[PDB]
Amino acid sequence: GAGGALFVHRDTPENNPDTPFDFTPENYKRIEAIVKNYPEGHKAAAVLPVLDLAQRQNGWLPISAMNKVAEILQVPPMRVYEVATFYTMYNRKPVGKYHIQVCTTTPCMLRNSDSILEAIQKKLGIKVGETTPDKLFTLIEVECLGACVNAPMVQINDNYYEDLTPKDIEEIIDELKAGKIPKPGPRSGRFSCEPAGGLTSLTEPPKGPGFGVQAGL
Amino acid sequence: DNSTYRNLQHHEYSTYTFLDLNVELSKFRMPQPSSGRQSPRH
Amino acid sequence: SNLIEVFVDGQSVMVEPGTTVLQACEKVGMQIPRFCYHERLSVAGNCRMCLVEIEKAPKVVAACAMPVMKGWNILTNSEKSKKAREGVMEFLLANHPLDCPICDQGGECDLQDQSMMFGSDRSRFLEGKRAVEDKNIGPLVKTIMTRCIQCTRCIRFASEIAGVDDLGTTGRGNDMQVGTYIEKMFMSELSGNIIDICPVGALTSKPYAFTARPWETRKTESIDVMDAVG
Amino acid sequence: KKTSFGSLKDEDRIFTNLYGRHDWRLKGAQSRGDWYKTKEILLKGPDWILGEVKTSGLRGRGGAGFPTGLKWSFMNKPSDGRPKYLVVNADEGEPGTCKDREIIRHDPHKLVEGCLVGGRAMGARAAYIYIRGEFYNEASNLQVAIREAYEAGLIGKNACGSGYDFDVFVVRGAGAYICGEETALIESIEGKQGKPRLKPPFPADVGVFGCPTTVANVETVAVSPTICRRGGAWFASFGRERNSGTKLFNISGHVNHPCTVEEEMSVPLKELIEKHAGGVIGGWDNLLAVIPGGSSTPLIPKSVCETVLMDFDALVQAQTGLGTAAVIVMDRSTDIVKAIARLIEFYKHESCGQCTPCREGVDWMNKVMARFVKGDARPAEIDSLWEISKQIEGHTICALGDGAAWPVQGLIRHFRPELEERMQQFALQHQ
Amino acid sequence: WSSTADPLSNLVLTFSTKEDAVAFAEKNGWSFDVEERKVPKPKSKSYGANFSWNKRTRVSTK
Amino acid sequence: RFRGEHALRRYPSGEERCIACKLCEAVCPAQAITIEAEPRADGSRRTTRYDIDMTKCIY
Numbered sequence A: 001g002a003g004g005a006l007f008v009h010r011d012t013p014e015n016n017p018d019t020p021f022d023f024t025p026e027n028y029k030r031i032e033a034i035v036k037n038y039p040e041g042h043k044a045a046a047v048l049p050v051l052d053l054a055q056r057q058n059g060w061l062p063i064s065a066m067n068k069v070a071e072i073l074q075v076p077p078m079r080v081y082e083v084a085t086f087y088t089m090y091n092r093k094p095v096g097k098y099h100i101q102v103c104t105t106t107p108c109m110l111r112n113s114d115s116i117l118e119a120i121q122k123k124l125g126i127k128v129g130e131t132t133p134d135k136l137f138t139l140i141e142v143e144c145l146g147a148c149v150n151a152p153m154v155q156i157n158d159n160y161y162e163d164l165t166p167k168d169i170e171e172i173i174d175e176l177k178a179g180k181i182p183k184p185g186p187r188s189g190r191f192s193c194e195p196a197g198g199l200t201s202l203t204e205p206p207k208g209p210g211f212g213v214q215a216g217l
Numbered sequence B: 001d002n003s004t005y006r007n008l009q010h011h012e013y014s015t016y017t018f019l020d021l022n023v024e025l026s027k028f029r030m031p032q033p034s035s036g037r038q039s040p041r042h
Numbered sequence C: 001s002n003l004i005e006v007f008v009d010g011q012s013v014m015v016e017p018g019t020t021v022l023q024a025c026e027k028v029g030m031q032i033p034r035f036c037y038h039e040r041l042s043v044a045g046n047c048r049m050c051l052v053e054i055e056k057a058p059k060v061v062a063a064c065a066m067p068v069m070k071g072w073n074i075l076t077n078s079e080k081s082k083k084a085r086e087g088v089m090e091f092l093l094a095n096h097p098l099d100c101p102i103c104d105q106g107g108e109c110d111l112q113d114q115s116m117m118f119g120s121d122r123s124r125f126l127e128g129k130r131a132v133e134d135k136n137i138g139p140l141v142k143t144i145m146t147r148c149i150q151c152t153r154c155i156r157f158a159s160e161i162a163g164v165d166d167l168g169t170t171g172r173g174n175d176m177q178v179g180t181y182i183e184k185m186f187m188s189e190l191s192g193n194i195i196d197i198c199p200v201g202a203l204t205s206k207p208y209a210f211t212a213r214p215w216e217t218r219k220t221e222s223i224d225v226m227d228a229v230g
Numbered sequence D: 001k002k003t004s005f006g007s008l009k010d011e012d013r014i015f016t017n018l019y020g021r022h023d024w025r026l027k028g029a030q031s032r033g034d035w036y037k038t039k040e041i042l043l044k045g046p047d048w049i050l051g052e053v054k055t056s057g058l059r060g061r062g063g064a065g066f067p068t069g070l071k072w073s074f075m076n077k078p079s080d081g082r083p084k085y086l087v088v089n090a091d092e093g094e095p096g097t098c099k100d101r102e103i104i105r106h107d108p109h110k111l112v113e114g115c116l117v118g119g120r121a122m123g124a125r126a127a128y129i130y131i132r133g134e135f136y137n138e139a140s141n142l143q144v145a146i147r148e149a150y151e152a153g154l155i156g157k158n159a160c161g162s163g164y165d166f167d168v169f170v171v172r173g174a175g176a177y178i179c180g181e182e183t184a185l186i187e188s189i190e191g192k193q194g195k196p197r198l199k200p201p202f203p204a205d206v207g208v209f210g211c212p213t214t215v216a217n218v219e220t221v222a223v224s225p226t227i228c229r230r231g232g233a234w235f236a237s238f239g240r241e242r243n244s245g246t247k248l249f250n251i252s253g254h255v256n257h258p259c260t261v262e263e264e265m266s267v268p269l270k271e272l273i274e275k276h277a278g279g280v281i282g283g284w285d286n287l288l289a290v291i292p293g294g295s296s297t298p299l300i301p302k303s304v305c306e307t308v309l310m311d312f313d314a315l316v317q318a319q320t321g322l323g324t325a326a327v328i329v330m331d332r333s334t335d336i337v338k339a340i341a342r343l344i345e346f347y348k349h350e351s352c353g354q355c356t357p358c359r360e361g362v363d364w365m366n367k368v369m370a371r372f373v374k375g376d377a378r379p380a381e382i383d384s385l386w387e388i389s390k391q392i393e394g395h396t397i398c399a400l401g402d403g404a405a406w407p408v409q410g411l412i413r414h415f416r417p418e419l420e421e422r423m424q425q426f427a428l429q430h431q
Numbered sequence E: 001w002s003s004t005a006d007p008l009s010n011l012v013l014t015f016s017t018k019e020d021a022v023a024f025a026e027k028n029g030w031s032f033d034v035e036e037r038k039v040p041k042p043k044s045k046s047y048g049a050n051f052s053w054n055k056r057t058r059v060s061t062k
Numbered sequence F: 001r002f003r004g005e006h007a008l009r010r011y012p013s014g015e016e017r018c019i020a021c022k023l024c025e026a027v028c029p030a031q032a033i034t035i036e037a038e039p040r041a042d043g044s045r046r047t048t049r050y051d052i053d054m055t056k057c058i059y
């Protein structure tokens, strides 16, 4: 429904144009490679990758990072502001170490995803969009994540967890709290979206090179 | 053959893998074309 | 020469290649409704108020952005175009605030006049309207962003005519807002023209606020003497 | 000639490494026949490739179903002075669809080879892949496959013993479904907001960076080299006329075994679910409605889904459209209006807001559907919502407004009595 | 309040053409100044010009 | 429904209801209303002049 996040920036002691931010030299090499990807005279096309790199280096996007990207790519700062406020993967506010996103679209909602949502609610003791006090987890409800067949599923810091049950999310959460990273992929041992007991496709070994090339080639 | 899953390589991907691969492939590209000027605002 | 023949309500007219439907209709003497199109700005195509029916074409086209093709018959007063105008006006007025008595652009509003001339006479919107917070861009332009219809005329003017890239859109969908995203005064020698180009009372003259109504004023055509341009 | 479809042999499928069971790297792709006689395809010329694609009867796999050969011939105009590019749409935005994700992470080399073949056919200097930002491991797999391709000389400097130069770049988005739209895809590549632009001018004339451009789906790009290798007529054999080939189908929702499978085109819907999905939960009698093409396409009830096929024309005859071949089923033990309202909420949250009809009307639709779910409305408002959907559809800049209006239209048309009953129950309960 | 002394302060007339107005003014004995009609000149609009490959007309946002 | 002497009303809080929209002055068949306005010290839209000539009014 309603968003709840403001699209206007107000100066804050920890978020202001004087907030310290800069690029580490290897990030600068990555930036120059990204710029080299596009045709000359169209440098800006690199606003999204450079901004994403800044977010990955810092964890979130302060206004100072936005201005730094704008001055590096020589584009008006308002353009970077529009890019950052348009796309939803950019964090304009500090976010926890483990950013948990739970898909609640209709295909995922059909396979009992609200139960997993409330299980995370109970396990962490924080609301749908709040952050745990120790700055370790942040829960966010998102749209389709491209894993409809593996519903229900969650996405935590670029890793996909699929075919979850409530219990499974408690093991994921407490393993993350322990310190190690749980393995990405579907649960129940179904191995990336085949029928659980069907296996109705791709059983016979694939044919070799040039199995059916037509004449004249 | 089939029973083994062969996509576990992504289980050890860092946060900088994509950009590092981009940097590595930067030396394999053609020289980019040029529109004539440094920027449309120029 | 290189002119092509097109028809506006069955009347033939010769137009240059690349001429859009709106200018072809202008050559006949009809003004297509518009909110986002301005002659001296780049074409945007946002307000969709210029949707007109081409004969033997199932889909309406944007007269402001669609170049005309040879042999086209533009049906401006067709039933489909009227229905499209009514729908677009309904969507425009769904979230507009009931600010007309307190709005400085009461008797000179393109929204009001085009609603009277091309829209319906009643509403069927039973929801609650949206309200966005006002911005501050200096002591010259008063901002009441709730009235904004997101036509993006001010952004295009600032970017192209004034050469200032301060204005833009932030957000997505319903709560997309026009502004600067930071407390910043849009200052230029041509800054006051965004008051004129804004069709609604979202941008208004601050020193002129609340003093008069358009129907009362008398118009005297004179020459500026503040510089040598005249 | 053929009347019954739905039996596709294991050796006769396109994506033999769909499930990631075999090596997804250059060695495994070579073992499965990838990059075989590719130099011959490059040297044969673009006209032959375009003819093979046209005679193959391949249609746009994105969802629209536009003949791909027609677009690739539109792009085949002589040189102008500007570089020419090929754009692969890997956004995969639509709900209930995962086909692009599986054929990228588990088989990138077919995508790379298709990119090269399409670039040669259309004279593209380089190919840009706009992979979804959330697909990070998939993007890394694609990039390492491209790295292997450069090492093997399959793409890059002359790409072959051919004399043709071609580069493949991968760019990433940031959580924006509207960026899947081809013009919005181009805008996002150019570093602006993902707001679609108006047509004309079409991408072939003015596309990315203002250069001629062609946007093609991941599946369409990936199938093309196999079409060139095995012949257009072979692909024309499958399915009915004007519906040639094979399609990837994703079955999700209330089924025993949710899965994605590659199968013949004109499979019956009931046959597909019973064969590959393991059947709908609780038996075929438990089925209430199914959405065939993903979120954008309108839902159909049991009676018409009993004997409906999977192709463009027949599903249009069912007033739905094939869409993206994303099957979502709903039994009779679920709140159907709740699901449709959730879809409308998703469309509300994913619109860019550039034009007034989509923005205002879709927000209005979300509010109206939220009120319908609780039954707080009146029976006379159903026709009002139908008229709102009519006003939205066909008047927006892009097709997202149409894709948000269609589910409401289908839900009204097929379940008006349910809405009326819910409103009556709410009125009785509140007096 | 605002007072006046000229009875012609609110008199405005409408004419189809400039010649009609000139004839009316001449036959009524009023000295007149005539201003030629200003017409907005035609303009070349192109939506594709917004997305220019090398031209400056390329827009930053839309 | 009887029409008598004119009066300006105000809200229960005590602030005047008039917002200087000038609709009454525009509609007046006898041109008996004269209105001038400006922003108030608190920024409210209020009148500084509101005259009705009752020897021109037709009630």
Ligand SMILES: NC(=O)C1=CN([C@@H]2O[C@H](COP(=O)(O)OP(=O)(O)OC[C@H]3O[C@@H](n4cnc5c(N)ncnc54)[C@H](O)[C@@H]3O)[C@@H](O)[C@H]2O)C=CC1
Pocket (backbone or CB within 6 Å): D060, D062, D063, D064, D065, D066, D071, D074, D091, D092, D093, D094, D095, D097, D180, D182, D202, D203, D215, D293, D296, D297, D323, D324, D398, D399
């Ligand atoms: N794969 C996914 O996740 C998603 C798929 N979709 C599907 O996309 C469909 C609509 O997409 P559109 O691109 O708007 O369909 P469209 O009919 O407008 O165009 C489809 C393709 O045909 C080209 N084309 C069409 N007419 C042309 C012409 N006269 N000249 C040159 N080229 C022409 C277009 O350039 C475009 O590339 C929807 O039905 C939806 O099912 C929608 C969202 C997500």
Ligand SMILES: Cc1cc2nc3c(=O)[nH]c(=O)nc-3n(C[C@H](O)[C@H](O)[C@H](O)COP(=O)(O)O)c2cc1C
Pocket (backbone or CB within 6 Å): D059, D060, D061, D062, D063, D064, D065, D066, D068, D089, D090, D091, D092, D093, D094, D177, D178, D179, D180, D181, D182, D215, D216, D217, D218, D220, D398, D399, D400
């Ligand atoms: C709102 C919207 C979102 C879309 N998202 C995608 C997408 O994520 N992936 C895709 O391949 N096509 C998507 N499309 C359809 C594209 O227009 C399509 O890919 C493009 O026209 C080329 O399709 P083709 O390869 O089948 O010819 C989307 C269309 C719309 C209207």
Ligand code: SF4
Pocket (backbone or CB within 6 Å): C096, C097, C098, C099, C100, C101, C103, C104, C105, C106, C107, C109, C110, C111, C112, C147, C199, C200, C201, C202
């Ligand atoms: S902008 Fe026009 S329609 Fe909106 S409140 Fe002001 S006068 Fe009324």
Ligand code: SF4
Pocket (backbone or CB within 6 Å): C147, C148, C149, C150, C151, C152, C153, C154, C155, C178, C197, C198, C199, C200, C202, C203
């Ligand atoms: S403030 Fe006025 S000119 Fe600017 S976008 Fe809004 S309505 Fe258009």
Ligand code: SF4
Pocket (backbone or CB within 6 Å): D178, D195, D196, D350, D351, D352, D353, D354, D355, D356, D358, D359, D396, D397, D398, D399, D400, D401
């Ligand atoms: S229909 Fe919606 S998503 Fe598409 S351009 Fe218009 S506002 Fe944007």
Ligand code: SF4
Pocket (backbone or CB within 6 Å): F017, F018, F019, F020, F021, F022, F023, F024, F025, F035
């Ligand atoms: S100006 Fe006249 S019509 Fe307007 S609020 Fe004041 S009294 Fe009422």
Ligand code: FES
Pocket (backbone or CB within 6 Å): A103, A104, A105, A106, A107, A108, A109, A143, A144, A145, A146, A147, A148, A151, A153, D094, D095, D096, D097
């Ligand atoms: S519905 Fe959950 S990933 Fe698409």
Ligand code: FES
Pocket (backbone or CB within 6 Å): C033, C034, C035, C036, C037, C044, C045, C046, C047, C048, C049, C050, C051, C062, C063, C064, C065
């Ligand atoms: S005037 Fe054409 S869409 Fe606005």
Ligand SMILES: [Mg+2]
Pocket (backbone or CB within 6 Å): C105, C194, C195, C196, C197, C198, C199, C200, C201, C202, C203, C204
């Ligand atoms: Mg104004």
